Design a protein around this nucleic acid. Structure first.
Ligand SMILES: [Zn+2]
Ligand SMILES: [Zn+2]
Ligand SMILES: [Zn+2]
Ligand SMILES: [Zn+2]
Lengths: 234, 234, 234, 234
DNA sequence: TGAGACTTGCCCAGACTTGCCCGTTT
DNA sequence: ACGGGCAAGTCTGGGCAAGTCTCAAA
């Protein structure tokens, strides 16, 4: 039990936001991103490239923090950590504590915090400008546990919160995306995108006894507008 | 020995009311809320989130009171406790009295009051201002005792009054909503919303073709919301 | 967790065994017995007459003990007691401890034991000869909890072990019968006897490949034996 | 490779051997034994009864010890213990070390040993004679892990060894059986006997028709049991 | 190295269970 | 005093979930 950190998108004064467009080779050979679900599908310990976008350059000392929380409300108050099994392993490069789920790769300037009040785990790195020629900064993450790990996430969906903060920790920007660490990213992505499709492309009409004339016309109208936009695979 | 607290629709000075995240009606769905009923169906021990909305932020310290008492008048003056089976059953938290129905997990500034004289269990938390970007406040409850339990609510309906206090605990806000804790929120929600519509179905009601199952739930999530106003001022 | 007491029928040197043939009025107005299931169906706290049969008269000091254990193997090691709710009640005539499920009625010579090693509950009464004219002794029992009581038996089927022991406690005879304490004995009995019928009204066939002439002979003969018993009662 | 406990069946001077109960191939059947494979299919932490048969009463102070080892030769030298997850969890039982895989229910005289040399785990209990009227004594075990727990048995098959030792620890008897702790005993069993049933099937087989699914499976059991004795006895 | 073909843990909707009220029966 | 019609809790097995094995084709 611990207070739940906000997950509301907030572009802030710098128009902070994330992107997931990276070469499908040597970087995406494992993981795949679903725009429709805003969910990343990656294997255990495999690198996940995330792009940081910002309109103007942040003040000196700005950092980028990554944190994980459970998506479902009945679990939002439970800290996200590694399972007993994976926790005890040499997989730790020394820098990252064995109990942290999220790891930053390719950056020795990373810093892992184990909040003394919320007991929440997070990893932080100094904000760095985009490479000349590009308009985004790249950050490489690694997830050290399967979403299914018993004792750990235990088949519970998680959400990664990326926050842009000043030297003092004050919020400057915040974005997020769902994550499922599994053994078959490609497969699982199809299944989920397929289930999403059905929930959308459903052909079972229904009825409702609306009241009044105006309110009646509201739905009746806003409905003919949507029932028209259905023309997508036409 | 004492009396029962009121529950008049008291918005307040700013604009204090409660909101509930729309839940998809199922069978064993952990939790769901009925708009046209103002009733919250939910299994026990399963965290339930309740939204806090308000215009201008009240004066610092102004806490938010949450209490629950039997719906019907016949037992309205009876203390709401748990069954002897659940009494023994200890909880992860000791900061919350065992014979307590309502709870507030993920918080530390929450007070699980226990009024001896009036004999009315309750709980209060310091109204937290909406996070930078966040448009409202959230609080998590965990009703620790079913309604059908023998030796407790014993099938007897309940209710939960969320009132806004102040430095001492006077008046500044008021809200309410029925709370039936069971093992089938979805199943029970149909049998009730349906049995409701089986009452006075005549008048201005015209048929309206609605495609899509989910989209069908959407059109009702609003038609009923507006239909509430047709009762709000009754 | 406690060692499981034997439940194997043992007529012993006295041909000890039970019978359940009692007037359907003032004695069976509540409970009913199923020969096909060897299961008694009785309401909470209602008297249940059981007949003790014996070929020759037992030595001086013989007693009759009644004990309850769970029928299903996964529960056999758990002591059978009353639920928290019913446990706390004036229903106790003083003689019988509030935690005992089984009670002997109409006999102030009864004695309730709460085993110091197995923690098992039981009630004992001195063996008494049959009434002149009859060839059986009657004993009246009372069950203080529904089979469904949560915290108690919790919908788990139980089995009552009646043992005939000498003054020292040594086993002389043992018999048993299943018991379901419910609110509608008649109803429940029909349902269960009806389900039993279907299971035996099964008329699907299967072929078996037996290896070895003498084996087939033995297997065949056995199957015929059952084939006949199928005609014996149709 | 330094020390592996024998698994050679040895009836000994007292004709020691085990027996089990007849279970149905349910879906989530708590426990079920397969005479065809001499393997027990049981759910995590659910009671498993094992019948102890003896031709003659063993000397005073005789004990029974259960120990688990891996069945596959390449793992025989690896101690069988609980996995990191389940290990870090104190169950209602406090007599058994948290790392031991096998536990004994309802017996406060059980003693758990951690061998100082072999480092193997084992639980021991006093041998008790059969209760008057019975032909065997019975022990109730519990397996605190799934055959598939990662960091534990890791989908590796285990063999449970029951030895009958004298007051000095000398061998008096030994029998054994395979164990699979899983979520669906019935299912997993039906599958194994299946693949087994489609193997070695040559010779002259007499055919016999049986009516009713229950009857058939009883016959099929006994027959599959004899086909096991035939095999190993050349 | 990409995905069928397993292996193996769990969800979950349609029963099924079961205490209780109620009007009618003997 | 026995069924019928509810109120709720829980069981059940088909289906889905999700890691691992393996074999042929880049
Ligand atoms: Zn893990
Ligand atoms: Zn309760
Ligand atoms: Zn009870
Ligand atoms: Zn385990």
């Amino acid at each position: 039990s611990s207070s739940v950190p906000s997950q509301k998108t907030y572009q802030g004064s710098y128009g902070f936001r994330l992107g997931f467009l990276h070469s499908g080779t040597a970087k995406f050979g494992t993981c795949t991103y679903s725009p429709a679900l805003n969910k990343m599908f990656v294997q255990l310990a495999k690198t996940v490239p995330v792009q940081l976008y910002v309109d103007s350059t942040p003040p000196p000392g700005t950092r980028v923090r990554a944190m994980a929380i459970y998506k479902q409300s009945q679990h939002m108050t439970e800290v996200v950590r590694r399972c007993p099994h994976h926790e005890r392993s040499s997989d730790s490069d020394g820098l990252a504590p064995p109990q942290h789920l999220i790891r930053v790769e390719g950056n020795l300037r990373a810093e892992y915090l184990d909040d003394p009040n919320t007991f929440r785990h997070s990893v932080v790195v100094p904000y760095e400008p985009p490479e000349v020629g590009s308009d985004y900064t790249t950050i490489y993450f690694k997830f050290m546990c399967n979403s299914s790990c018993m004792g750990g996430m235990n088949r519970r969906p998680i959400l990664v919160i990326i926050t842009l903060e000043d030297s003092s920790g004050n919020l400057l920007g915040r974005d997020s995306f769902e994550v499922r660490v599994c053994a078959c990213p490609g497969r699982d992505r199809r299944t989920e995108e397929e289930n999403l499709r059905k929930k959308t492309m459903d052909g079972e009409y229904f009825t409702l006894q609306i009241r009044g004339r105006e309110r009646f016309e509201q739905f009746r109208e806003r409905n003919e507008a949507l029932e028209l936009k259905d023309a997508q695979a036409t």
